[PDB]
Amino acid sequence: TDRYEQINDYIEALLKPRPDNVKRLEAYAEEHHVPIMEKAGMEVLLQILSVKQPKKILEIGTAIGYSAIRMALELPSAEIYTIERNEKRHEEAVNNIKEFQLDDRIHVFYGDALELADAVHVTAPYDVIFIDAAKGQYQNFFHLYEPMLSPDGVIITDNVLFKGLVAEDYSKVAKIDEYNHWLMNHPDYQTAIIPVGDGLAISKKKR
Amino acid sequence: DRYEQINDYIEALLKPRPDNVKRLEAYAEEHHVPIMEKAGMEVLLQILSVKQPKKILEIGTAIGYSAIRMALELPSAEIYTIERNEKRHEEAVNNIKEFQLDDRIHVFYGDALELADAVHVTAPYDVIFIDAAKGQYQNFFHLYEPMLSPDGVIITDNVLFIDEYNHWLMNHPDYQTAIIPVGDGLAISKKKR
């Protein structure tokens, strides 16, 4: 256990335990290897959103609706639009959202996010775009959906450090490392990388 | 270890600051001034850039580095900062003067536990950044969180590199807090409702 995982455990040990129905989602995700947001990364996400106070959020990668539900609980007035291409997890997301009674505010698209731009554009623009899907298609998601961002909006990307594997010589992850370089050298966006959980990138339109 | 490797990776990605800012970073390294770590400062500024605060309170100026960085990020913002060491206060005032930010950044001299009433004149504050003596963190929070705006944010550096404060802060009834493991550790606190 290195210093990174020790600190993560220390932070997790300080967290207030979530409600029972939220813990059930975390338990299910562990059981079925659903890569939901790490506990520590989720807390940082929510606190940034709580500062941002967004009215509309776009999420790419619903899985079982965990992050969408957490975000919704944090922001009672906010509406959330989320995409998922897997049929089973889409099914689970819709049932979970229904069970929490957040189906009035959380809206799930079914299908690949690279083919749903026009349907998502109907309810653009979005104050926050949260990218948390296939790592190889990160640059495509950003390019496709950052026109729908509000003027003072923020794009947040999970899994940009990838368990610290991007930081070392990884060749013998190149796509993630490329995205990070591409994102940090973007002419329209200023970006900070937060080393929490699996790594968060927070991007914002330049002045 | 992995922690320092990730930090180096993030530092390697950073766009280089202006020359006068780099001189502050160089001076701080030369003279063991514990300014905000490069990676931690970027996270701070990006959160502030989202917050877009009009008034910031800072406890622990040192040589004016974090105050200057915050000021450059937020052209409209006014910053009020405290420093009890005479030499660092001297350096802060000269640095701020050299950057020509002395119209917007205002430095108090003295212990922050004895300057509450002078700070209260220009209350309230959208952001309170605590970055001073680690032993007096609970006293700073108690003293200065009444001057926080309704939708304000309290940010504490040096929470990982104290254990009592972290427990105290995480179990505060009026505030919700997340810990960011970057640099020396950041805590971001905010009113629950």
Ligand SMILES: Nc1ncnc2c1ncn2[C@@H]1O[C@H](CSCC[C@H](N)C(=O)O)[C@@H](O)[C@H]1O
């Ligand atoms: N191109 C694509 N279009 C839409 N869905 C995607 C995508 N590629 C991956 N996915 C989905 O995105 C999910 C990533 S995991 C999502 C985790 C979730 N945000 C949480 O924290 O709770 C997977 O379930 C996968 O099915």
Ligand SMILES: Nc1ncnc2c1ncn2[C@@H]1O[C@H](CSCC[C@H](N)C(=O)O)[C@@H](O)[C@H]1O
């Ligand atoms: N109780 C107190 N009142 C005011 N100043 C304090 C304090 N205890 C510590 N200090 C000052 O706070 C500084 C901590 S270093 C501050 C670093 C600065 N925020 C930056 O990132 O650039 C020290 O220079 C110390 O002199």
Ligand SMILES: [Mg+2]
């Ligand atoms: Mg993820």
Ligand SMILES: [Mg+2]
């Ligand atoms: Mg510090």
